[PDB]
Design an enzyme around this catalytic site. Structure first.
Site, PDB file in Angstrom:
ATOM      1  CG  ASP A 133      -1.749  -1.289   1.298  1.00 19.52           C
ATOM      2  OD1 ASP A 133      -2.194  -1.811   0.253  1.00 19.52           O
ATOM      3  OD2 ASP A 133      -1.925  -1.783   2.431  1.00 19.52           O
ATOM      4  CB  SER A 134       4.033   2.214  -0.475  1.00 16.30           C
ATOM      5  OG  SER A 134       4.865   3.343  -0.616  1.00 16.30           O
TER       6      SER A 134
END
Ligand SMILES: [Mg+2]
Ligand SMILES: [Zn+2]
Ligand SMILES: [Zn+2]
Ligand SMILES: [Zn+2]
Ligand SMILES: [Zn+2]
Lengths: 46, 115, 67, 404, 51, 1131, 206
Positions: free
Chosen positions: F760-761
RNA sequence: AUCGAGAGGA
């Protein structure tokens, strides 16, 4: 020393000293803004 | 707050060496070239030119951290050869290739503008 | 608020194309044909002109601080 | 330092780390050590505590350091394993047809910290020297550990017939003397389960060697994935026309089956089974029909997938997703349940004002016969929102009771 | 049982494939704010004088 | 004539646009406030009783008329001037208008010596005004006029300005009143309970709840009881019926059982009769009621009087509170008993607590009315005391001095300022969370906050039933937009076409029913009620009818013609039970729908034609409603409606599903709210993703309002280059997202590139960021005022000096001017001074009280404003400007729940590139897609590639069969791209092709308020709290992080005892005490003179030093405060 | 007095391309200049002074950037394409500033990047199989492809290496595209020459 | 500065 302010409604350059109610002399509006400083601020265009 | 200046990727800090050579002790005739303030642009070409040398047994490079601004190039050569000599010859060959490419691009531009 | 200078992706200059883009749109071009007339062939620059919202025109509806 | 994430659930939520000063303003973590913390990078923040004495420093260095924390006493298995990109990529890397060239191999060997500097003899010498991904992971694997695992796609009837020790699918992981003799590595071999390579590395080799093993897998595999690449797009969510026709035929047959059960119940031709009332028996029959439809359509979608499908890649490696997710993206989202039952009649004998009264059909009661790529209809959208609201409520309400 | 403490820091976490599992990448501002009281000895007199 | 399918998608959206041209998005707020000012205040003033005071002379003081002028402001000189809302925001005034009431005082002493004195326009209070309401100075102004006044024309209004702070009233859910609801509590003495929260039409008292319950089985049978108000003991229903004058059992069952052919009801009521036979007359029953009450009068006379008053006033006020209404009350209580018996006999379903047909939304108007009733009552009370103390002296009094206007003014102002909804004294009985500070972070956040609903069930409650998305929320509440924290399902949001009814009087409907063939309830015989249909109006059973069908036809015709029945009136015919319930009260959430003829829409093509030229022929939404083509249907009338999702449902099919539809959806996408209407393809996402986006659209940066240059907001983020989405829904045209967007179209590549986007980056393009990609400006306003409260001490703005000021920090004050205020354009770093304020002392005669910057900001002063506050001392606001360039740790999100922080930024040569040298602005990880199933993200990326290559804006409206993935792929293959949105990318570092073709294309991304620089914090021996000498709390306080109980438990499990002691003793609050070795109590130590002694033991030699936490010393001292002796025995 | 704050204008001015053809080689980096903050040997002075007195909106464009050096001017201002828009001004609004332009490259900031896109390609027909198309028929052909339409990709070349790289270097305006390529080759060669100089010092110092 | 309330983040 003068601390000239601008009127929020009439946009008038007027001088006001300390211990003075904040009132424009041209229209009596109660909100005033300071003018942009004369100091030299530098920006890197980045 | 923590943003490094953008020039720190290109500019050497005072007292910091552009390139440092360290003997690799694991295998013979191997060296580590730690090059500061360079990136994949020179690392990839130097590695690939070193791979063209049959006297080079290993040629690799890495950027150990993208936020840091150095590369390490490991070069191992045959015993009769040297990794420093291999690295020098690779740079010389790249320079000659780029000089030839520049002259030929000048000629091609002249032909294209003329006819 | 104002048309960006460069395309964020490639860095092509789009700042000088907003006014021409609007003039082409009032000339009864479709947005695609208008973007083709200005030479925006990569969909990144087409994104830049096609998705721009000129908010500065609304910010110029307010009188300035000084007359 | 001690590095902590809240809620601090077990002893692995506060581990010792060595500081590495880096430019920008975030705490930078290794990606294997995210599972112990239950940490992802969607705005999570973590707490750093600096011990202020040599005694506390020695305490943390000898008790709470992350390599000492690889195996958890909770379930006698690793608590951290190989994770998303490194797991999809190591699955792709240890496939049988991964051949690396001399320059690529040297590029990858640059990222082995525990490399003796000797290039291994390539698996293929002629017509052109080629190393295999297993041949480089063998260099990554530490010590002389021995391990047998099975890739997730290992057929269950292969260990019986011939080819048990020469697997056609390159399943049946076998590591011998620290060389990956065969098999495709995945969650089962590098994850947090018991008896995996990371566990056997920690048990045979120390915690230091295992630390280096984690780091080397991540560095080598990420730098190879720079060549291989991994992605996902619309093309991975699409199925062929034959698969779509099969799924639609399955759904049509299932809806006709539910209509038949409804007609039986309406005509009193349905008798209850022992231990249930007639309503509950009708609900059981309908739910069985629709679950069968969902499973059949999901199997159709799963078999339709190619070897290049990226959903299948991530599911096979165990990096992320499951076969049910693929089924919902390709085939059918399925039945939406509220409190373990179909959508309740929140109106008067209706689930929505768009249905007739007393409509126990599949679409009326919350069966989403579309996929996420097909798109939900408005009633399917609302019922799916109801089912998802149930999960949000559960997630937000269980926390207080479990924490207490 | 729980209390606020000194020598603590907090910020958003970020991936870094180039750290070992036992490393944590720390900003220079957190590290410049936080300090460790190191005892002086003839072994470290010069380094600590430098600092 | 008929709208064909090929035109339908235009026609419906044309209709929808007309709606939003007429109503807007904050119509419920404005209509509520308008009804409150036009009607509720006058009703409250007139409904108050005249205060008759006499020693002799007497005075009545009747209030007769109200006048609410426009908002004005009174200076110190007292000149009234019209006050503009922006002036109120800047000067910290309250945008309120004066309320004047006409008062009539007539003198009556004796001898017919009567004379009336009328005080016209007696200033009774100040009422804050909702912006853009009818009584707002911005009412009817054009966009040019609003811009002349420094107002945003896109500003919806719907909020108040109290002390310069924009406050928004949140609609509060409550159970509807005057309706009988039969529930069944599993754990209770009663099997079934039928409750009725009864409240008179014009509210004057709280809701009087009456319960009619059945005792759970296990004397002989099931007994029916009635829990009347103001009575602490159950009362048999037969006793209540007799107390109302119905003594004969036949009469009581005539009122309860309408069909005497039904012995089941009879035997189930028989126990109640058998239990009440000793009481057989009205007076005895009233005495029994008074005796069971909590104030049992010793004499039966006052008992009977009290029972009479309770049964006439507190029992079922909505049926009627006057006398001679016992017949109506008896019929209604019999209906309650009938409903309870029907539930107990299984003939009716238990009522659903969660059904929104059973709920009402308490909006700004009815909430301000509750406040105004309380406050006007308090004002009349104060007037009564003031006038009494004067007439007791036998002389006249001035009502102007009797009216202390501060009651109404300060009450409304306090309640809207704090949110504590109630009297300021009852600050704990009051319910908070009403009247929140308007969210001005982005235009979507403002709209959603103005359309916010609240279920006051209590966040502590862990029952999921009220949090569940009920079926009846369809079309009324957004299925997606809800907070994902502790208030899941409790805080809700209106759907786009949802309209909360404002309220109406039932008088015309009742009059028409009288003129029509309805029979009143007092005139009928009960024998007629069997086959007849009951008619309820606002909960009151008013009569019966014989042909309910043609009655409903007549009433629906009347409402569709805009005749006596107004559009918001709900008219439900329950057929199986013969009730017809008509509702005109406020708070009923409803939505517009297209009426359907036999199997056809009434919306013909002529209506679409007139709607297309809406701006010429002034044919508007109201003409569509007046034509009988559209109808507002509430949640309770939806139960009786058969909807068509689209006109395609009205087509005759091979097997007809319904063939008897009555209404049609204007468009199903209108079930979504403001923030969910921005998601493209929300029907291709998992629903939690849509909820997370609906929450995250509110933290997205953009331009929250056009006139942001003049607003002195405490916090404000403005994006440099907001873009409208390339892929949009047809609902954002009305949310004004195109005029104030909150994101940028980014070329996003879903790929695994270097591993810096895992979990989730995202990887952003440093070159794009250099070009102004997702750059923002952060404006922070500091306020200050110099108070001259008294001659003891006065503050003043002036450049401090090192020789006179005492508490003067070492920071330099050179940036300040002689006025004490910094000037615009001055670059200010952390800890710098922006306002030099000094306060006179009782480093002499003045101390420094300057305002510093919030630490670690490093902005530039944007502007400085000086004015006078309400009382009139100098008042300063300084806005400082800080450019936020996106960096590692800043949070970004797409419109599909796909959030993540920037992992790293690569330059354009380091990013992967296509054959035509396009690099992605953002790279997100493929592992964020599969578990999440955000296929809308992928479809939006592909549609956006098509849109950018085609020169259009993609249509991502949720339910659109004219747009699917195969069409988009076929379109994309026409522009020379892989039809599925993949491209061959090259490694930026080596230039080699990536083996796996990457999925890349334009996607609308958002930059969220959560930047890492506002979150990073560190501590090493900073300030400590006063009470317990532990680190402070917060970044702003330079506080320390909490090493909590769970951290203690973790370190106990680790076995790290010295680290645990360091964290919980040495890094928090080390301390030393001296303990007496004999009594173990803390001794008196004097380390300067070295004299240690315990006053208790009278020893000074056996004292010991103990190193303990300061919190533990404080604990032991607080225990000694409780007479506990914690003796620390060192042996 | 414009509606865009100071950093907005500054950032916007930084991204205006300035003709750099013959002057960039002559100017020095301010790091290397032995002068004070500025001098004509390492920098170019620009001035901008606009005031909207008239009733229509005044477009402050790159044409209003007046330079002291005639050789270094805004590209659009060079003697069609319109001028880059710096800011729109309303009557009474005014913008007066003084800029200095410096020598730099894209590693430091994208404003010093001379390219408006660098298309780079090799092996247009996937003969080296550096890409692996799951369905090679679905992919469009490169503009440099030499394949008949029935053929989707070239037959695999086991002995092949990447040769014949195709470039399309688009210029933002500052440099001519051929000047970009020539300056790129010269810069890469000087990077290698400096590296070799430092290498020789390190070898001889050992 | 304290207290409360509210809004948020994980
Ligand atoms: Mg997280
Ligand atoms: Zn003035
Ligand atoms: Zn572009
Ligand atoms: Zn003692
Ligand atoms: Zn110089």
């Amino acid at each position: 020393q003068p601390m000239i302010y601008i009127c929020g409604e009439c946009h008038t350059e007027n001088e006001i000293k300390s211990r003075d109610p904040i009132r424009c002399r041209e229209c009596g509006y109660r909100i005033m803004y300071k003018k942009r400083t004369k100091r030299l601020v530098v920006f890197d265009a980045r | 707050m923590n943003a490094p200046p953008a020039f720190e990727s290109f500019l050497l800090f005072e007292g910091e060496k552009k390139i440092t050579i360290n003997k690799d002790t694991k295998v013979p005739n191997a060296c580590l070239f730690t090059i500061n303030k360079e990136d994949h642009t020179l690392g990839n070409i130097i590695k690939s030119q070193l791979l063209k040398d049959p006297q080079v047994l290993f040629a690799g490079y890495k950027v150990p951290h993208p936020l840091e601004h150095k590369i390490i190039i490991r070069v191992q050569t045959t015993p009769d050869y040297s990794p420093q000599e291999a690295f020098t010859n690779a740079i010389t060959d790249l320079i000659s290739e780029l000089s030839l490419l520049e002259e030929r691009f000048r000629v091609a531009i002249k032909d294209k503008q003329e006819g | 608020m104002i048309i960006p200078v460069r395309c964020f992706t490639c860095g092509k200059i789009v700042g000088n194309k907003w006014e021409a883009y609007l003039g082409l749109l009032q000339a009864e071009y479709t947005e695609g044909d208008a973007l083709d007339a200005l030479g925006l062939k990569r969909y990144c620059c087409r994104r830049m002109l096609l998705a721009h919202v000129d908010l500065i025109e609304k910010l110029l509806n307010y009188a300035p601080l000084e007359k | 330092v001690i590095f902590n994430r809240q809620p601090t659930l077990h002893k692995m939520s506060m581990m010792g780390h060595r500081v590495r000063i880096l430019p920008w303003s975030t705490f930078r973590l290794n990606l294997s050590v995210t599972t112990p913390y239950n940490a992802d990078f969607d705005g999570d923040e973590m707490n750093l505590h600096l011990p202020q004495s040599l005694e506390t420093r020695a305490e943390i260095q000898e008790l709470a350091m992350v390599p000492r924390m690889i195996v958890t006493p909770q379930s006698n298995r690793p608590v951290m394993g190989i994770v998303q990109d490194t797991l999809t990529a190591v699955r792709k890397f240890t496939k049988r047809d991964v051949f690396l060239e001399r320059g690529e191999v040297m590029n990858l060997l640059m990222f082995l910290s525990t490399w003796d500097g000797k290039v291994p003899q390539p698996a293929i010498l002629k017509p052109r020297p080629l190393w295999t991904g297993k041949q480089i992971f063998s260099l990554i694997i530490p010590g002389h550990i021995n391990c047998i695992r099975t890739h997730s796609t290992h057929p269950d009837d292969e260990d019986s017939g011939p080819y048990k020790h020469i697997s056609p699918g390159d399943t049946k992981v076998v590591v011998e003397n620290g060389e990956l003799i065969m098999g495709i590595l995945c969650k089962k071999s590098l994850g947090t389960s018991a008896g995996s390579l990371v566990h056997i590395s920690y048990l045979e080799m120390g915690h230091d060697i295992t630390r280096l093993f984690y780091s080397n897998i991540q560095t080598v595999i990420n730098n190879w994935l720079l060549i291989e690449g991994h992605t996902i797009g619309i093309g991975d969510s699409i199925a062929d026309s034959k698969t779509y026709q099969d799924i639609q035929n399955t759904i049509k047959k299932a809806k006709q089956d539910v209509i038949e059960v409804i007609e039986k119940a309406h005509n009193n031709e349905l008798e209850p089974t022992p231990g249930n009332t007639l309503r509950q028996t009708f609900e059981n029959q309908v739910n069985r029909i629709l679950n069968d439809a969902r499973d059949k359509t999901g199997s159709s979608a799963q078999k339709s997938l190619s070897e290049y499908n990226n959903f299948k890649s991530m599911v096979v490696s165990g990096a992320k997703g499951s076969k049910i997710n693929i089924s919902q993206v390709i085939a059918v989202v399925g039945q939406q349940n509220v409190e373990g039952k179909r959508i309740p009649f929140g109106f008067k004998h209706r689930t929505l004002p768009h249905f007739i009264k007393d409509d126990y059909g599949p679409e009326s009661r919350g069966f989403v016969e579309n996929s996420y790529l097909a798109g939900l209809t408005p009633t399917e959208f609302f019922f799916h929102a109801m089912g998802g609201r149930e999960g949000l409520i559960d997630t937000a309400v269980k926390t207080a009771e479990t924490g207490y | 049982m729980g209390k606020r403490v000194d020598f603590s820091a907090r910020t958003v976490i970020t991936p870094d494939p180039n750290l070992s599992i036992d490393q944590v990448g720390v900003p220079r501002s957190i590290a410049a704010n936080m300090t460790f009281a190191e005892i002086v000895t003839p072994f470290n007199i010069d380094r600590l004088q430098e600092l | 004539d008929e709208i064909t399918p090929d035109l339908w998608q235009e026609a419906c959206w044309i209709v929808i646009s007309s709606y939003f041209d007429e109503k807007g998005l904050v119509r419920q707020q404005l209509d509520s406030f308008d009804e409150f000012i036009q009607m509720s205040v006058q009703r409250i003033v007139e409904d108050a009783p005249p205060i008759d005071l006499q020693a002799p002379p007497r005075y009545l003081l009747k209030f007769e008329q109200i006048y609410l002028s426009k908002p004005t402001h009174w200076e110190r000189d007292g000149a009234p001037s019209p006050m503009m809302p922006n002036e109120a925001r800047l000067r910290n005034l309250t945008y309120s208008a004066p309320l004047y009431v006409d008062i009539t005082k007539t003198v009556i002493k004796e001898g017919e010596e009567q004379l009336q004195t009328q005080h016209q326009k007696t200033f009774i209070g100040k009422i804050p005004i909702m912006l853009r309401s009818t009584y707002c100075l911005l009412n009817g102004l054009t966009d040019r006029d609003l811009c002349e006044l420094n107002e945003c024309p896109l500003d919806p209004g719907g909020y108040f300005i109290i002390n310069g702070s924009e406050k928004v009233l949140i609609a509060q859910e409550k159970m509807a009143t005057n309706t009988v609801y039969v529930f069944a509590k599993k754990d209770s003495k009663y099997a079934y309970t039928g409750e009725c929260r009864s409240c008179l039409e014009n509210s004057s008292r709280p809701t009087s709840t009456i319960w009619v319950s059945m005792l759970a089985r296990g004397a002989i049978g099931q007994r029916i009881v009635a829990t009347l108000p103001y009575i602490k003991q159950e009362v048999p229903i037969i006793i209540v019926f007799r107390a109302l004058g119905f003594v004969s059992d036949r009469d009581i069952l005539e009122h309860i059982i309408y069909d005497f052919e039904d012995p089941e009801m009879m035997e189930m009521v028989k126990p109640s009769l058998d239990e009440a036979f000793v009481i057989q007359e009205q007076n005895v029953a009233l005495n029994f009621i008074g005796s069971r009450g909590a104030k049992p009068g010793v004499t039966k006379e006052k008992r009977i009087k009290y029972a009479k008053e309770v049964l006439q006033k507190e029992m079922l006020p909505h049926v009627g509170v006057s006398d001679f209404c016992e017949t109506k009350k008896a019929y209604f209580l019999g209906y309650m008993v009938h409903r309870l018996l029907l539930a107990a006999l299984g003939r009716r379903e238990l009522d659903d607590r969660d059904h929104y047909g059973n709920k009402r939304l308490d909006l700004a108007g009815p909430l301000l009315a509750f406040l105004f009733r309380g406050m006007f009552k308090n004002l009349l009370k104060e007037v009564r005391i003031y006038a009494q103390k004067f007439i007791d002296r036998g002389k006249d009094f001035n009502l102007e001095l009797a009216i202390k206007t501060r009651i109404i003014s300060d009450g409304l102002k306090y309640s809207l300022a704090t949110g504590n909804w109630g009297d300021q004294k009852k600050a704990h009985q009051a319910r908070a969370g009403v009247s929140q500070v308007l969210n001005r972070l982005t235009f979507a956040s403002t709209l959603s906050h103005l359309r916010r609903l609240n279920s006051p069930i209590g966040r502590d409650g862990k029952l999921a039933k009220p949090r569940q998305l009920h079926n009846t929320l369809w079309g009324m509440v957004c299925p997606a937009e809800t907070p994902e924290g502790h208030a899941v399902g409790l805080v809700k949001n209106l759907a786009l076409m949802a309209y909360i009814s404002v309220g109406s009087q039932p008088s015309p409907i009742l009059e028409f029913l009288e003129e029509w063939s309805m029979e009143n309830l007092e005139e009928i015989s009960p024998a007629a009620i069997a086959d007849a249909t009951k008619i309820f109006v606002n909960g009151c059973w008013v009569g019966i009818h014989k042909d309910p069908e043609q009655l409903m036809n007549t009433l629906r015709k009347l409402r569709r013609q805009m005749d006596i029945i107004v559009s918001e009136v709900s008219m439900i015919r329950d057929i199986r039970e013969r009730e017809i319930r008509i509702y005109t009260d406020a708070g009923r959430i409803c939505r517009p729908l297209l009426i359907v003829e036999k199997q056809k829409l009434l919306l013909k093509k002529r209506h679409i034609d007139q709607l297309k030229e809406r701006e010429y022929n002034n044919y508007s939404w109201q003409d569509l409603v007046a034509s009988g083509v559209v109808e507002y249907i509430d949640t309770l009338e939806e139960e009786t409606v058969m909807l068509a999702m689209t006109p395609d449902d009205l087509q005759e099919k091979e097997v007809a599903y319904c063939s008897t539809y009555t209404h049609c959806e204007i468009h199903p996408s209108m079930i979504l709210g403001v923030c969910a209407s921005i998601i493209p393809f929300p029907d291709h996402n998992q629903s939690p993703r849509n909820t997370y986006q609906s929450a995250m659209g509110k933290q997205a940066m953009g331009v929250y309002i056009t006139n942001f240059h003049v607003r002195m907001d405490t916090l404000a983020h403005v994006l440099y280059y907001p873009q409208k989405p390339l892929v949009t829904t047809r609902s954002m045209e009305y949310l004004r997202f195109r005029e104030l967007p909150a994101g940028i179209n980014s070329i996003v590549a879903i790929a695994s590139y270097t591993g810096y986007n895992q979990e989730d980056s995202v990887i952003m393009n440093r070159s794009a960021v250099d070009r102004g990609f997702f750059r923002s400006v952060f404006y922070r306003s500091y306020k200050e005022q110099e108070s001259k409260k008294g001659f003891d001490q006065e503050e003043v703005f002036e450049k401090p000096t090192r020789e006179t000021c005492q508490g003067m920090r070492h920071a330099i004050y050179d940036k300040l001017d002689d006025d004490g205020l910094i000037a615009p354009g001055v670059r200010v770093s952390g800890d710098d001074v922006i306002i030099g304020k000094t306060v006179t002392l009782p480093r002499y005669t003045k101390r420094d009280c300057s305002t510093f910057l919030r630490t670690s900001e490093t902005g530039i002063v944007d502007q400085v404003m000086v004015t006078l506050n309400q009382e009139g001392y100098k008042f300063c606001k300084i806005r400082v400007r800080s450019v936020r360039i996106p960096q590692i740790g800043d949070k970004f999100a797409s419109r599909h729940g796909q959030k993540g922080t920037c992992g790293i930024q690569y330059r354009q040569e380091d990013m992967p590139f296509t054959c035509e040298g396009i690099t992605p602005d953002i790279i997100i990880n493929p592992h964020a897609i599969p578990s999440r199933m955000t296929i809308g993200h992928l479809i939006e990326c592909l549609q956006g590639k098509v849109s950018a290559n085609k020169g259009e804006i993609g249509d991502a409206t949720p339910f659109n069969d004219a747009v699917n993935v195969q069409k988009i792929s076929n379109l994309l293959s026409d522009y020379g791209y892989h039809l599925r949105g993949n491209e061959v990318l090259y490694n930026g570092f080596t230039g080699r092709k990536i083996t796996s073709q990457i999925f890349i294309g334009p996607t609308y991304y958002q930059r969220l308020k959560h930047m890492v620089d506002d979150k990073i914090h560190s501590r090493a021996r900073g300030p400590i709290q006063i009470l317990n000498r532990q680190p402070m709390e917060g970044r702003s306080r330079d506080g320390g992080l909490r090493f909590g109980e769970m951290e203690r438990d973790c370190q106990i499990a680790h076995g790290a005892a010295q680290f645990l002691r360091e964290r919980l003793f040495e890094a928090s609050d080390p301390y030393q005490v001296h303990v007496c070795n004999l009594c173990g109590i803390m001794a008196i130590a004097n380390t300067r003179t070295h004299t240690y002694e315990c006053r208790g033991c009278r020893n000074k030699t056996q004292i010991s030093l103990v190193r303990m936490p300061y919190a533990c010393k404080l604990l032991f001292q607080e225990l000694m405060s409780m007479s506990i002796a914690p003796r620390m025995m060192s042996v | 007095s414009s509606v865009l704050h100071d950093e907005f204008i500054a950032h916007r001015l930084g991204l205006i391309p300035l003709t750099s053809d013959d002057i960039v080689d002559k100017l020095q980096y301010s790091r290397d200049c032995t002068c004070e903050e500025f001098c004509p040997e390492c920098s170019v002075e620009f001035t901008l002074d606009v005031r909207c007195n008239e009733d229509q909106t005044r477009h402050v464009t790159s044409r209003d950037l007046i330079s002291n050096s005639p050789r270094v001017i805004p590209v659009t201002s060079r003697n069609e394409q319109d001028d880059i828009l710096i800011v729109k001004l309303r009557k009474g609004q005014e913008l007066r500033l003084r800029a200095y332009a410096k020598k730099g490259f894209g590693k430091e900031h994208a404003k010093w990047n001379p390219t408006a896109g660098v298309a780079f390609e090799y092996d247009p027909d996937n003969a080296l199989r550096h890409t692996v198309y799951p369905k090679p028929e679905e992919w469009p052909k490169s503009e440099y492809s030499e394949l008949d339409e029935d053929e989707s990709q070239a037959p695999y070349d086991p002995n092949g290496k990447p040769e014949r790289f195709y470039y399309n270097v688009e210029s933002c305006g500052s440099l001519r595209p051929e000047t970009i390529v020539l300056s790129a080759l010269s810069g890469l060669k000087k990077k290698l020459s400096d590296l070799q100089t430092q290498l020789s010092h390190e070898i001889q110092s050992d």
